[PDB]
Amino acid sequence: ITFYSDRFLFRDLVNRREASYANVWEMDDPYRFLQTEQDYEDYWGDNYDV
Amino acid sequence: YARGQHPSYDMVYAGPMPEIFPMRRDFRKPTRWDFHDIEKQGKYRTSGPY
Amino acid sequence: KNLNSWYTKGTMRGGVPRIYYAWMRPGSFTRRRFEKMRNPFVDLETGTSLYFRDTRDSAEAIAHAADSKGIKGMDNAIDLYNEYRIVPDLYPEGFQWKHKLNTEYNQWRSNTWLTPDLIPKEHRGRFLCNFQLNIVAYDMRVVKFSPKDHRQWIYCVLYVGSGKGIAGWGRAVAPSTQEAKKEAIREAFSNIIAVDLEQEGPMYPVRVNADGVRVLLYPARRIVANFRVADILCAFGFQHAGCRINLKATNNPKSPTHTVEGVFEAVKALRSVSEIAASRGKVPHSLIYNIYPYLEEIRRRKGMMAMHPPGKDGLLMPDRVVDNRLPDHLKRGYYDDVYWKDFFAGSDEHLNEPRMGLRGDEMRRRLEEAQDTRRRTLEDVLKRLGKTTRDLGSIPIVNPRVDVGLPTHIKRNYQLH
RNA sequence: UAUGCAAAUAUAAAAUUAUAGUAAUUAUAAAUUAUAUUA
RNA sequence: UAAAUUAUGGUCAAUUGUUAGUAUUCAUAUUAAUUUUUUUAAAUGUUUUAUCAUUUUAUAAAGGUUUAUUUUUGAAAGAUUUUUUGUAUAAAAUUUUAGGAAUAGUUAAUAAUAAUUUAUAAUUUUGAUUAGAUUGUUUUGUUAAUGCUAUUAGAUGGGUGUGGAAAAAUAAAAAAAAUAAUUAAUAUAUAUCAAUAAUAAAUUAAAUUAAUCUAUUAGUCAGAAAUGGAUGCCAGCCGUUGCGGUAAUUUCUAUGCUUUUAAAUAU
Ligand SMILES: [Mg+2]
Ligand SMILES: [Mg+2]
Ligand SMILES: [Mg+2]
Ligand SMILES: [Mg+2]
Ligand SMILES: [Mg+2]
Ligand SMILES: [Mg+2]
Ligand SMILES: [Mg+2]
Ligand SMILES: [Mg+2]
Ligand SMILES: [Mg+2]
Ligand SMILES: [Mg+2]
Ligand SMILES: [Mg+2]
């Protein structure tokens, strides 16, 4: 039930607006959602292979 | 990410997780309160649907 | 670390069903009034100039130095179907389909259609739902019309409810039992309240008193309440509410009336979370996902996607006047090579003479669907011979029912072929 | 008809009665009640 | 006088009485208890020793205390060949009675003083002393919760004063100076105040060692459940509004019928 302020997204907004990418694959790879190991452990918990 | 300039993807940016492949029809499972004679659901026998 | 599991939260009421929402409230579902552009906003021309403010500097909107060409950002539609939803929806669109009449929708989906007398005018064709009727109490009051005349009037308290999020309660004093029942029911449909079930129970304590009855409606793990209060709160579809009337249960005043009026009053004082969030001018945590695609193509706008064609604004003014229209005789054989001959044949919009080029049969068809002296027309000559209109087909006559010679018929239709 | 003596409603409180063991309550206000010299 | 994020972290507060115009925590609810049931206690002779003696063996009798109860190692532990030390008795907080007045071998200084030392003394209305009740500062019950409501029992003056310490006159369940004994936890029929037993209270059977037990209640107007028969403001019912005036679904009786099945009822 947290209520964010109006401008809450600003930091991320200037981070996105100023991003830059070597190629377009880096721009959207499927895995940019993941940084820490916890991220990789949540994303693949399903395949016992990976 | 380490200097804090990486565009964030948080759980705040996730919408609804949609039903993609609709499961199956769940057919009506016969319970003890569905009986065509009022007798089979008695007070001396049936204390509830299950 | 949150030991209450959302897995087990609730109270089995036995047979009583209640609705739940997969994601949002169903009224907020189809957004078509902003999507297909039915709103008063678009109709009033005012403010449409503002899509195009870049035109205010002519040599710039050609040059494309500034990336902002549009009202909300980089272009006029970046995300049309996403961004705007980040405002809490206070006044959702609801049910918008007109394919039947309101009374036909009402008829099919609601039992309420069967009892037209029990419903007020404002709600008449408006309900799609089935309602349960629960009669809390009957009672007798003496009504004195005069110092001799005395009537026995009775007194009803009940509440109409449907677990799909809508209830209401009423009470009445009438001459007969049936009368007071019906009166109470239309008094209960007059007072109908609804509840936003996005939150499934109150997120803060509501402390409110009906006349002399102090009520507390607070968040709980499940439904806890007096049996009656409980299935009243079930009539709204609350899973997580819990509620108490008058501290100790023995506290005065306590009547069945009081018990009902209390919980309904309380629920009527409850504020939805979305409403609270808009109230402070803030963005709810739940609605932020809608901003994501916007934020996404901010990130992705680098490079060529940010680039606009040099020299070209997209606004091309008319300069000359063009008319390609032709006299009919010119277009009679104009498209013969591209398509078949007699291209415009029965076309009413594309010809000044709709009947030209037509072979006799098709000319006869039109009149066929369309339908003073001692002379015989050729019409009744056909009726007494029994040839109708079809048999004459190698003869230049189209309209059989005119009185004129064959030569006349030839000259009237001559320009057509 | 304010020279003796004389604190005392202007409210700090926990269901009525009762010297603080008696009875089981009490209190309460707008429904209803035909004659007051108006063109 | 700015927001914040490297995102659910530091581990669950959550309230259930069918009422009767209205005002006021007050009958009938649940939990906890007393009503209520013999599955945990127990019998007398303590014991050595150098002989009429001397060594070992220290807080369950009663009385009614609210400014109240406080202490050592010299005994044993305990180890070297002999002289071995110092630390203690004092205080501070918390203290009850619906309607409230004085209390007294008495304060402080002197000192191993004074039944007649010296002094303008001490306790009390910020509630004393007598007098009632009462076993004091990790223990319970209810509850979402600051609360409300319990907690036993055990220190009762001196008078040849022993002993390290008075705790010293039945009433153990503490092995008490040689390994009594550990194949023991079982103690028969007594007590005191505790110690919650209707332990799958009803159909397929007890991987036993078959030992203890033969086990039932309520309602029947309101509100699950009714008819006969009496009775006639009587007899009686009464958690409560109230019922009983020859037709009582509210008494009594007979028979059925109702229950969500450790019982009704009383406190
Ligand atoms: Mg940042
Ligand atoms: Mg009461
Ligand atoms: Mg003693
Ligand atoms: Mg005393
Ligand atoms: Mg003290
Ligand atoms: Mg002392
Ligand atoms: Mg003595
Ligand atoms: Mg009944
Ligand atoms: Mg009786
Ligand atoms: Mg008789
Ligand atoms: Mg009878």
Task: Describe this structure as you would to a colleague.
This is part of a larger assembly, with chains A (50 residues), B (50 residues) and C (417 residues). Chain A is mainly alpha-helical and 50 residues long. Chain A has helices at 10-17, 24-27, 37-43, and one strand at 3-4. Chain A is flat, with a radius of gyration of 15 Å. Chain A starts with a strand and ends in a 7-residue tail after the last helix. The radius of gyration of chain B is 26 Å and the shape is rod-shaped. By secondary structure, chain C is of the alpha+beta class. Helix content of chain C is 25%, strand content 13%. Chain C has a four-stranded antiparallel beta sheet with strand order 1-2-3-4, sandwiched between helices. In chain C, a hairpin with a 2-residue loop joins strand 5 and strand 6 (213-219). Chain C is flat, with a radius of gyration of 37 Å. The chains are: A mainly alpha (50), B little secondary structure (50), C alpha+beta (417). Chains A and C meet through strand 1 and helix 1 of A and helix 8, strand 8 and helix 9 of C. Bound molecules: magnesium ion (11 copies). The structure holds two RNA strands. Chain C: GO terms for molecular function: structural constituent of ribosome. Chain C: InterPro entries: Ribosomal_uS5_C.
Question: Span from first to last CA of chain C?
Answer: 91 Å
- Work out the radius of gyration of chain B: 26 Å
The largest sheet of chain C is:
4 strands, antiparallel
Shape of chain B: rod-shaped
Secondary structure tally, helices of chain B: 0
Strand content of chain B: under 5%
**Helix amount of chain C:** 10-25%
Radius of gyration of chain C: 37 Å
**Quaternary organisation:** part of a larger assembly
- Assign an overall shape of chain C: flat
Q: Element order, helices and strands of chain C?
A: HHHHEEEHEEEHEHHEHHHHH
What portion of residues of chain B is helical?
A: under 10%
Number of strands of chain B: 0
Q: How much strand of chain C? A: 5-15%
